[PDB]
Amino acid sequence: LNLTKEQHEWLNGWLELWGAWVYSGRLEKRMSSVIAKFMESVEPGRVMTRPMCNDDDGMLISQVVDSVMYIDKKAFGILLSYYAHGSSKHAIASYYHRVARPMLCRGRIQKPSLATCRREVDEILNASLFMIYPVLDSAFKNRKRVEKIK
Numbered sequence: 001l002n003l004t005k006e007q008h009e010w011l012n013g014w015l016e017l018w019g020a021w022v023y024s025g026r027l028e029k030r031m032s033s034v035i036a037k038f039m040e041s042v043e044p045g046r047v048m049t050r051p052m053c054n055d056d057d058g059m060l061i062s063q064v065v066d067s068v069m070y071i072d073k074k075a076f077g078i079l080l081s082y083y084a085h086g087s088s089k090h091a092i093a094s095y096y097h098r099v100a101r102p103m104l105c106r107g108r109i110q111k112p113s114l115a116t117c118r119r120e121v122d123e124i125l126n127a128s129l130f131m132i133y134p135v136l137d138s139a140f141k142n143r144k145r146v147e148k149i150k
């Protein structure tokens with residue numbers, strides 16, 4: 001199946017705010033080893049420019065995303081490259097297309113090109129969002145309920 005237009009737009013905005021929040025260093029490293037190792041692989045010093053969520057929402061989204069994506073560490077890395085580091089899908093595709101194959105974009109009768117790799121990157125991100133959406137929606141709805149109690 002696939003998410004609807006409004007569901008994708010809703011989730012993408014939250015993940016943009018979360019990615020900016022994570023990239024600023026506001027997520028403590030022990031919460032997610034995958035996210036911790038990722039932030040160690042990005043050039044330091046970069047300044048904040050995009051808007052970010054508050055610490056509560058950031059923690060909630062981090063817990064949801066980690067609980068869903070920790071099994072597919074490569075998809076998790078691509079999600080983080082896109083949302084946290086801010087790399088374009090084009091840049092991610094070009095990267096994985098011009099590497100030394102030490103998983104993604106291996107190559108189908110035709111030789112692997114930038115177009116096929118971009119397609120794979122798009123599909124990985126779409127599948128990730130599809131898996132994340134129900135968990136995040138439930139987490140947000142659950143917090144609201146619990147927050148109302150007394």
Ligand SMILES: [Cl-]
Nearest residue numbers: 027028029030
């Ligand atoms: Cl920390």
